[PDB]
Amino acid sequence: GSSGSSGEDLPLPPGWSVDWTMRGRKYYIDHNTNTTHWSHPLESGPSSG
């Protein structure tokens, strides 16, 4: 099935941007709050809609 809950490339909100570090980790950046998150912002308590 799924590798291991690595990610679902969910539709990031307006203002966010994902980037891979040298090592090879995927992190999401929030330009609205100026903060980073290892896991998707919608995955853990999205509270969007």
Swiss-Prot record:
Phosphothreonine-modified residues are 21
Domain annotation WW: ranges: 10-43
If researchers knock out this gene, what phenotype do they report? Mice show progressive hepatomegaly with a 2-fold increase in liver mass relative to total body mass at 1 month of age and a 3-fold increase by 3 months of age. Embryos display unchecked proliferation and defects in terminal differentiation of epithelial cells.
- PTM characteristics: Phosphorylated by STK3/MST2 and STK4/MST1. Phosphorylation is not required for SAV1 stability and may increase the number of protein binding sites on the scaffold molecule.
Q: Summarize tissue expression.
A: Ubiquitously expressed in adult tissues with the highest level found in testis.
Q: Where in the cell is it found?
A: Nucleus; Cytoplasm
Q: How does it assemble?
A: Homodimer. Stabilized through interaction with STK3/MST2 or STK4/MST1. Interacts (via SARAH domain) with isoform 1 of NEK2. Interacts with ESR1 only in the presence of STK3/MST2. Interacts with WTIP and AJUBA.
Q: What does this protein do?
A: Regulator of STK3/MST2 and STK4/MST1 in the Hippo signaling pathway which plays a pivotal role in organ size control and tumor suppression by restricting proliferation and promoting apoptosis. The core of this pathway is composed of a kinase cascade wherein STK3/MST2 and STK4/MST1, in complex with its regulatory protein SAV1, phosphorylates and activates LATS1/2 in complex with its regulatory protein MOB1, which in turn phosphorylates and inactivates YAP1 oncoprotein and WWTR1/TAZ.
This chain belongs to the protein called Protein salvador homolog 1
> What is the organism field in this record?
Mus musculus (Mouse)
Coverage span on the entire protein: 198 to 233 of 386
